[PDB]
């Protein structure tokens, strides 16, 4: 029965119940249903008008908190002598909820999510005075042509949604829409992306938002700067389906749900909850 | 034009602010909403589902032996079988539950709990248990005469294989905190203990060491507020291939 | 978009500004309002309550002897017992009162005061006092013939053990200031003096040195404005364990 | 009253006399794809009796040292009967499932089965950063044994696995769990040979224990597809 629930439910008073046939404490877990034993039906209650709002447990309010999804300190200098592995004043980033575990465990509570990403790009700068650098954050789709240089002609943004912003400005906030080809983001994808057997397991590219190619629009300055670009994603307009067990073991990788666990309890493989002495030993005991 | 002035709090990025922001892809047509089964619109739907306690959170219980409690035939009268730390917000048997893992995204919680214990002995195994929720203030009761003064349920083993120990919301305060102090009046919940009402009595062909799977859900009274990040997960370094998401 | 321009006063943090600010915890459900007894919605409720004067603010009155005034049997006629500095805003007997400590959070004050004197002799102790509020301008009156020309009350000691010397609001200005100048026409209030109307007359088994507890409240005429920080409290260094609130 | 249950699908039928109930997963009964949710424009073949019937999988020996068993759907059924031939000949499928897990023992045995149907069970390998390959996931009709079922082989918790559609086979109380699964995918239809929506998971939370003569107690699984559609006809692949 679907009903609008704004506050937690009231408790009716109850009296002495001595009745054959009606055993409300006795329930069947084997049916899979959670026990419907009301607190009135189990113990003797008073009338309580419960005014506690349930609004902070809304899945919209649960997940619409702008959490960190990307962070790169990258050097901002002459890159004529640097190696061809570091960021030559730009970084591509396939937009990925899996990189940071606080938002990842929250989004992996559910199986399917339908949200709009409210990407806030916080750029901060340190010296190896601070410059007022202008940054471009060109939104490239999944697999499309990502730039090769800082001053390459992919940054002209004929159709890719670039956002130009400065360090001295407030952080650039754009709204990435619901960009899955399916009706929800498959947070877990039990299956393979490709038709051949070489495809990566669990990684649905429909779950992938796209690339976030971020460069610094200014040319290279005679001193080098370490520019750290933090990206904050706020899921919004959130519809969520099929909740899951929250992940207890520590994450190993962003590409999959591999597990190793801690060496000892808590959150270990053989023992998730921290150990105690016996089953009849109370750890936090009020001894006076 | 319009005479304005910047307030304190201008140009600051609060993470939990709720403001309309600039659309990156204009006139975007999102994928049409399909009826996917099992929509959660409120996290208290997830909390009210039963989920197994690790009452056997000891050593020498490796992995799955932590979810069940081995009870045996006893030669002594009215013996303690197990007691359960009731700190949802702290580490203990309630932590890795649906009522526990979601409430560790919060700080203040209210409402009544719901402990369900499914006996998993033989059909020939007959026994009776008492499940005493003691409201806090004193020590964990070790004798049954001490514990049955509190809120309890006496459970016969027959056709129905589960009781519900309703843990009533007995608190002075409207909610209860996390503090890292399990012995605080604002945080401590009480003690659920279990004693042999009579005994676990099996015949010669049943196993003498039967089991108990302990569930906990929350009720419709339940409530959560003051959202925080979970202490159940951590991150020491970058995850593997997270540098390869930039390459 | 909307053509705006920043006024002078943009981006400045005034402490006493009243603007809606960004909620840190969105869709927060505060604890429901319970009827707690004794709600103060206006600080003039606190001010209109009587509270003891330290009329005996001398040396050799250590601690609690400062709250009472020892009056004795006298062999001379019409003697001065005590006089009270009426500067609420300055240091004096009215300072550590409810009318005094709250008004030292303000600068401009108006309205009538209310001095109540509770005699604490024996039941056999009979006496009469005059309580002369002299409006300011001249010296504090030292003889009773000088003081009874002002506003006074003559008080017999019987069943009822207290009078009210209403200090009427006699001022040219609508309010009265603090200035650190107690002798200013904008700040000075006057002088309450007390004289033996007849005498304090006790029998041979009562104590010869009876007491007077002097109260002051304010009336419904009273008013306060121009809020300031209190000079009654100071802070030279950080308080102890204030560094431990950061650890 | 609810202990007896006959499930008539197609020519197949299953009675059970110690049943708990049957779990209509997330309160949702399977149906065909409606026109407002439909995507593939060609007319889907709906055989309605050649596939909508109980395909009984191979039984697995419920033992003392057993960790668990899992069957990924429809990977368990992509080579069985007319569901398998419709899978191999079509690009798309949309089918709910009616899992009926059979496991009985005497009234002297004890044990508990968490018969839980996990939607989108992205497995994880243990103590490595390499993702599970094709052979580690797509076991087919045989199914797979859990390696660490206490964490459900994906770092999550078995203790919270009752958030999924689940029933219990407590050998004390019942002997058959029945979970009626709808179409659980973000897409309306999908390619069956490279994706599995539901994963039936069967876990020994209480192991098989008795003191009598140790007869073999197996766990038989009878998964019936429900409300099958199949678009995109072509040649078979297998």
């Amino acid at each position: 029965i679907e009903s609008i629930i704004k506050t937690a439910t009231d408790t009716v008073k109850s009296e002495i119940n001595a009745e054959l046939g009606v055993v409300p404490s006795l329930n069947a877990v084997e049916t899979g249903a959670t026990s419907n034993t009301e607190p009135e039906e189990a113990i003797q209650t008073r009338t309580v008008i419960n005014q506690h709002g349930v609004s902070e447990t809304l899945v919209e309010n649960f997940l619409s908190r702008a959490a960190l999804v990307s962070k790169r300190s990258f050097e901002y200098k002459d890159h004529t002598s640097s190696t061809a592995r570091a960021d030559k004043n730009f970084f591509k980033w396939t937009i990925n909820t899996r990189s940071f575990v606080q938002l990842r465990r929250k989004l992996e509570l559910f199986t399917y999510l339908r949200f709009d990403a409210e990407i806030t790009i916080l750029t901060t700068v340190a010296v190896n005075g601070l410059p007022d650098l202008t940054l471009q954050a060109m939104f490239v789709p999944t697999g499309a042509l990502t730039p090769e240089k800082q001053d390459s002609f992919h940054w002209q943004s004929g159709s890719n949604a670039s956002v130009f912003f400065k360090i001295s400005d407030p952080p650039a906030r754009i709204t990435i829409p619901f960009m899955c080809i399916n009706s929800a983001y498959s947070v877990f994808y039990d299956g393979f992306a490709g038709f051949e057997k070489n495809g990566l397991y669990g990684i649905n590219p429909a779950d992938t938002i796209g690339n976030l190619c971020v460069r610094i629009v200014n040319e290279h300055q005679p001193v080098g700067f370490t520019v750290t670009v933090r990206v904050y994603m706020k899921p919004k307009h959130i519809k969520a389906w099929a909740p899951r067990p929250p992940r207890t073991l520590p994450y190993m990788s962003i590409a999959n749900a591999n597990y190793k666990g801690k060496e000892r309890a808590p959150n270990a493989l053989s023992a998730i909850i921290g150990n105690r002495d016996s089953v009849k030993t109370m750890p936090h005991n009020i001894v006076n | 034009g319009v005479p304005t002035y910047l307030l304190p709090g201008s140009g600051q990025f609060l993470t939990t602010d709720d403001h309309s922001s600039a659309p990156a892809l204009p006139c975007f047509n999102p994928t049409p909403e399909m009826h996917i089964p099992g929509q959660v619109r409120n996290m208290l739907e997830v909390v009210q589902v039963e989920s197994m306690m690790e009452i056997n959170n000891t050593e020498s219980a490796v992995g799955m032996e932590r979810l069940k409690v081995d009870i045996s035939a006893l030669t002594d009268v009215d013996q303690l079988l197990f007691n359960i730390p009731l700190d949802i917000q702290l580490d203990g048997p309630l932590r890795n539950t649906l009522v526990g893992n979601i409430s560790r995204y919060y700080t203040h919680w209210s409402g009544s709990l719901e402990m369900t214990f499914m006996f998993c002995g033989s059909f020939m195994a007959a026994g009776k248990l008492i499940l005493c929720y003691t409201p806090p203030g004193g020590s964990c009761p070790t004798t049954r005469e001490t514990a049955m003064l509190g809120t309890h349920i006496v459970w016969d083993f027959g056709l129905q294989s589960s009781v519900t120990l309703i843990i009533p919301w007995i608190s002075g305060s409207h909610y209860r905190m996390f503090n890292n102090d399990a012995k605080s009046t604002n945080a401590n919940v009480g003690y659920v203990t279990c004693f042999m009402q009579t005994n676990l009595i099996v015949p010669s062909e049943s196993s003498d060491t039967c089991s108990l799977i302990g569930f906990i859900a929350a009720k419709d009274d339940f409530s959560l507020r003051l959202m925080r990040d979970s202490p159940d997960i951590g991150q020491l370094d970058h995850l593997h291939a997270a540098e390869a998401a930039y390459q | 978009g909307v053509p705006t321009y920043l006024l002078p006063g943009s981006g400045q943090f005034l402490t006493t500004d009243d603007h809606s600010s960004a909620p840190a915890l969105p869709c927060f459900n505060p604890t429901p309002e319970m009827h707690i007894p004794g709600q103060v919605r206006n600080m003039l409720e606190v001010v209109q309550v009587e509270s003891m004067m330290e009329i005996n603010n001398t040396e050799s009155a250590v601690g609690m002897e400062r709250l009472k005034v020892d009056i004795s049997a006298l062999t001379d006629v019409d003697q001065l017992l005590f006089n009270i500095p009426l500067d609420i805003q300055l240091d004096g007997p009215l300072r550590n009162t409810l009318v005094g400590n709250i008004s030292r959070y303000y600068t401009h004050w108006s309205g009538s005061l209310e001095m109540t004197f509770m005699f604490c002799g024996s039941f056999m102790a009979a006496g009469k006092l005059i309580l002369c509020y002299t409006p300011p301008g001249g010296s504090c009156p030292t003889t009773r013939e000088t003081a009874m020309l002002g506003t006074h009350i003559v008080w017999d000691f019987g069943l009822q053990s207290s009078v009210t010397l209403i200090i009427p609001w006699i001022s040219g200005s609508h309010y009265r200031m603090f200035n650190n100048d107690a002798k200013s026409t904008n700040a000075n209030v006057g002088y309450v003096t007390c004289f033996m109307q007849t005498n304090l007359i006790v029998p041979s088994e009562s104590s010869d040195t009876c007491s007077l507890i002097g109260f002051i409240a304010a009336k419904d005429d009273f008013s306060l404005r121009l809020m300031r920080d209190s000079p009654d409290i100071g802070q030279l260094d950080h308080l102890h364990a204030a560094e431990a609130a950061y650890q | 009253s609810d202990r007896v249950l006959q499930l008539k699908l197609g020519n197949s039928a299953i009675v059970t006399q110690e049943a708990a109930n049957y779990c209509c997963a997330y309160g949702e009964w399977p149906n065909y794809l409606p026109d407002h949710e439909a995507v593939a424009i060609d007319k889907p073949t709906q055989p309605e009796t050649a596939t909508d019937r109980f395909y009984t999988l191979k039984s697995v020996k419920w033992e003392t040292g057993s960790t668990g068993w899992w069957w990924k759907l429809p990977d368990a059924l992509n080579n069985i009967g007319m569901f398998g031939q419709n899978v191999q000949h079509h690009y798309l499928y949309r089918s709910g499932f009616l899992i009926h897990v059979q496991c009985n023992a005497t009234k002297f045995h004890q044990g508990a089965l968490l018969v839980v149907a996990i939607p989108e069970h992205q497995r994880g390998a243990h103590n490595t950063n390499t993702s599970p390959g094709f052979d580690d996931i797509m076991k087919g009709e045989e199914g797979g044994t859990f390696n660490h079922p206490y964490v459900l082989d994906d770092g999550t918790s078995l203790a919270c696995a009752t958030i999924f559609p689940h029933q219990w086979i407590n050998l004390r109380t019942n002997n058959s769990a029945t979970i009626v699964l709808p179409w659980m995918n973000a897409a309306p239809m999908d390619f069956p040979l490279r994706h599995n929506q539901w994963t039936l998971a069967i876990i020994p939370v209480v192991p098989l224990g008795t003191r009598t003569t140790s007869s073999m107690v197996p766990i038989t699984v009878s998964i019936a597809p429900m409300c099958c559609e199949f678009n995109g006809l072509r040649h078979a692949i297998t």
Binding site: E2, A33, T34, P177 | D18, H19, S20 | - | -
Partner: peptide, 30 residues
Amino acid sequence: QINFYKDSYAASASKQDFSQDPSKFTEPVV
């Protein structure tokens, strides 16, 4: 609340959907 954009996804978060149905989880049986 404000939403001066031309796209309905660009609005603020819809923190008003108080409709919940726990009985598809707590009582998923028929």
